[PDB]
A paper describes a structure:
Factor H binding protein (fHbp) is a 27 kDa surface lipoprotein consisting of two β-barrels that promotes resistance against complement mediated lysis and is a key meningococcal antigen that elicits SBAs. We have shown previously that fH CCP 6 and 7 (fH67) are necessary for high affinity interactions with V1 fHbp, and that these two CCPs are sufficient to inhibit binding of full length fH to fHbp. Here we characterised members of the three variant families by identifying amino acids that are critical for fH binding and through structural analysis, to inform future vaccine design and to understand the basis of the interaction of fHbp with fH.
For instance, Ala substitution of Arg106 or the corresponding residue (i.e. Pro106 in V3 fHbp) reduces, does not affect, or increases interactions of fH with V1, V2 and V3 proteins respectively; our results with V2 fHbp are consistent with others showing no effect of this residue albeit by ELISA. Previous work indicated that V1 fHbpR106S exhibits a degree of enhanced immunogenicity compared with wild-type fHbp in mice possessing extra copies of hfH as well as endogenous mfH. However we were unable to replicate this finding either with the corresponding protein, V1 fHbpR106A, or with two other non-functional fHbps, fHbpDM and fHbpI311A, and did not observe a relationship between fH levels and SBA titres in individual mice. Immunisation of transgenic mice with the non-functional proteins, fHbpDM, fHbpI311A, and fHbpR106A elicited similar levels of anti-V1 fHbp antibodies as determined by ELISA, demonstrating that the non-functional fHbps retain their antigenicity. The non-functional proteins also elicited SBA titres (measured using human complement), that were similar as raised against the wild-type V1 fHbp.
Author numbering:
A (entry chain A): 321 to 443
B (entry chain D): 79 to 321
Amino acid sequence: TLKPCDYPDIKHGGLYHENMRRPYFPVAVGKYYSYYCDEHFETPSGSYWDHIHCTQDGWSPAVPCLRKCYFPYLENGYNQNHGRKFVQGKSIDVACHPGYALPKAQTTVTCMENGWSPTPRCI
Amino acid sequence: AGLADALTAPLDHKDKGLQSLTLDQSVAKNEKLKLAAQGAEKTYGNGDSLNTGKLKNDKVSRFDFIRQIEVDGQLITLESGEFQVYKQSHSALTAFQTEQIQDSEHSGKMVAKRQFRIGDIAGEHTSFDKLPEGGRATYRGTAFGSDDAGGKLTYTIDFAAKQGNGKIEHLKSPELNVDLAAADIKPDGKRHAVISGSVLYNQAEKGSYSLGIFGGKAQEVAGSAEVKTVNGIRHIGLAAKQE
């Protein structure tokens, strides 16, 4: 038989209408529910909300909420990527103005689950 | 209509119920919701109350919405469109018809995107432990989706069996005129009477529905439904009352 899905504990998010949905879990394969992502996080579709589906392999998507890193303004650096959105795992090069550089001889910043690593700032 | 009064006038005890509606799921703690109608304007406020008493019962009240966030002492628009309020005597629900949102790829850009989502579903929750011991009750009301408030909702609850079932009719989109399958009444975390079951179209499962029982004598039902159609998932606002 197919294993029913228990209440989904969505990392950096959760289900809408939690109080009404929670007493009816575990749920059968094929069931789906609208879910949200917390601040600074988004769905694989690029929105703050979508639907999580109970499949034979469990909840789909497996990673419902991914970190979104917005490239900040560089006081003493080149601002072509200012305001540009980057999803978790994606990297971008930091171009600083002459006489300025990253925290420790670095040139690339990566959007991790917690945010930018390292912090994009020219001196 | 009472749209301007709902935004400007303070809370009055003599007003027709539901008098007040706490905006919790409609406005997040970090954000602000700016509502405008009939020349009036008001900003909320997670936990702030909407003066529903000034609005008309058994109808959809429409407002222009702006979802704002304070960045450098100024309010910046994240999402805009139409804010819908369906008022009943012991229950009320909010809906968001998104027209514009902040570009998913850029923080400083706004794009035209249409989305329909149910915000709050609140009122005087019926306790699961205070429900009638027996008898059958028929609830008649409205089913409302994107650009359509003409849907008809019929729901029946058997208090002896602690079960409920219903039907949606007259919505412009035929696929949304679904059957609300037989489902058990269960207590929630706060021991409020709730109902959740399957949504069926032509005897095939298309999604789920959830309802909350409202009023001291279980007079009303309010909630939502999420239905799969040929062109994607569509949400429906649900609200019905006893005759």
